[PDB]
Design a protein around this ligand. Structure first.
Ligand SMILES: [Mg+2]
Length: 117
RNA sequence: CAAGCUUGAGUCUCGUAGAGGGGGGUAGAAUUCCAGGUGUAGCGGUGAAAUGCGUAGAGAUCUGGAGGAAUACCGGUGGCG
């Protein structure tokens, strides 16, 4: 319906899940898919493979604009940091730049207590 | 008890290092919140879940603003009291 050809893959990779969002340079959301909503729950949801099909499913709800180049923004420590990026590149995508944007406070907010499991 | 003596103890001069104390300014990261743009069905959480949150449009992304609290890297059997 419209045209971009130049995008950015923001991947949010937490421990429990990994959300993939495709966007233009402006930061406007073009398409998105998550692992948790691609048929993966709990123990399987938090896997690199689930992040992979997330990246794959996302490349199908965006090529309506015919993106052809993009940059990658890796946020968080979970799986699908890396495997998500791979799936994008195999789905027919030229990777321009890779950047980690995981936030690091300069020691500000006190985090939750340690879990005594 | 009286006179002393200069090594103990002080005083003087010029410098050095320091998270030593008290007051006042100020900074950039992040969280949460408020207001919007893009976007759409999930997010969140766990060993597994559910409670919880989201079509009154969340989460994700970009933008502007409010507020509080603490000061990554430096950073170290480093330093000061
Ligand atoms: Mg802020």
């Amino acid at each position: 319906r419209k045209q971009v050809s130049d995008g950015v893959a923001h991947i949010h990779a937490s421990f429990n899940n990994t959300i993939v969002t495709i966007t233009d340079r402006q930061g406007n959301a073009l398409g998105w898919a998550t692992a948790g909503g691609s048929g993966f729950r709990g123990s399987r949801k938090s896997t690199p493979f689930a992040a992979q099909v997330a990246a794959e499913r996302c490349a199908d709800a965006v090529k309506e604009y015919g993106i052809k180049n993009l940059e990658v923004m890796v946020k968080g420590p979970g799986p699908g940091r890396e495997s998500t990026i791979r799936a994008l590149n195999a789905a027919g995508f030229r990777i321009t730049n890779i950047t980690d944007v995981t936030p690091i406070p300069h020691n500000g907010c006190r985090p939750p207590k340690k879990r005594r499991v």
